[PDB]
Nucleic acid binder design. Sequence first.
DNA 1: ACCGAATGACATGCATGCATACAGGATGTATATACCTGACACGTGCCTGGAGACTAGGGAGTAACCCCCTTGGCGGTTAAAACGCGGGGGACAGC
DNA 2: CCGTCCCCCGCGTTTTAACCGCCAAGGGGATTACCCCCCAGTCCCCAGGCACGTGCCAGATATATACATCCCGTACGCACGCACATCATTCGAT
Lengths: 99, 83, 56
Amino acid sequence: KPHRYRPGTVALREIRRYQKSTELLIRKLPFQRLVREIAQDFKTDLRFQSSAVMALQEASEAYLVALFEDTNLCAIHAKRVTIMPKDIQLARRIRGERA
Amino acid sequence: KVLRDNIQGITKPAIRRLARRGGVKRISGLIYEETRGVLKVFLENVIRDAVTYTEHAKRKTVTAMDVVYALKRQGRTLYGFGG
Amino acid sequence: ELAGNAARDNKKTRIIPRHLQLAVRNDEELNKLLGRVTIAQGGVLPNIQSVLLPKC
DNA sequence: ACCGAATGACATGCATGCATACAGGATGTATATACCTGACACGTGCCTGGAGACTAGGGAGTAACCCCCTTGGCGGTTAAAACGCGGGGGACAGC
DNA sequence: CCGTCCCCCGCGTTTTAACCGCCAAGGGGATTACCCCCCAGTCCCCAGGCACGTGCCAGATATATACATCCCGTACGCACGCACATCATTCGAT
């Protein structure tokens, strides 16, 4: 009885929404708390200039999007629509970032 | 009977050999047309750089150096012919 | 110059990076020059593949 | 071969499946509206680095020679290419 | 999963054109020799640029509303099958 959108149509709304805007996507505070954790063993007691914690965010996210875009052809090239883990292993392989 | 656009001088069996070396098992019939495109793109660039040095260096002879360098710019260094 | 057109063509008179990426990605001659960079705060080009559209 | 009565055939009604245009309904989006202000664009020093003039001497552009190695040509074999085809299994489509 | 069919492929002719080997010439790479004009370098001088504040501005940021869009149900068409009566045909006597 209650109205429901069909599956998939809500996504297309976002694809036209998030591709329009230009703010960040990953939650800020955890993403910094990751960079300290991962950087913890390269050196002791590192202090990131807070200008350069976002500078990763605007430089790693413009890399994931450069990935999800690029698998999306491959999942399309395999007659499918959904991306699957088997897709990325290809996608990083042509570039040369895993092999 | 050789007077034609020499791009067909890269004959179809030659194309087949490469794909074998590349590990290709079954080659479609249409690949023989698009490959002559790709190779026509690639040499369009590398010679474009290659002449520029020579035209610069007052040399009317494109030399082995002035193609090792041009390959270096594309991020494909070519060991062996100089350096 | 190309950026200035796009921002005015989005009714905004001051260039902001989202107005600045459109002038390099959409300009085919420059896109081969900034092919590696990733302009900060840049947004991305609006593009949905044809297969992605609904059935109708 | 037609009347006579029964019956398969011819034509249709009936009912339904299906398609579908749409309107309703809701949702969402875009508009034009207010308010607000970090944050732009000069302004104003204020200074050091760009500008003027000066010499000085390599370093590049000249001419002049050479030679080598590229391009040209030119017969021979023979290897690889161009061509046919026979058929199967790899794509393709559908459920 | 079913199953389809065609379209590449081996494999076999036969045309050829790379392949070499050699011959020939000189264009032209490469090198020497000269020299000048040209950039480095110093000294001096100065306005062009950066730092600092400043406000104002419009630029942004939020409102509310009109409008557009999607989706389901709907009904409506419609061609359908089913089903019928009737048009038509057949078996018997005429």
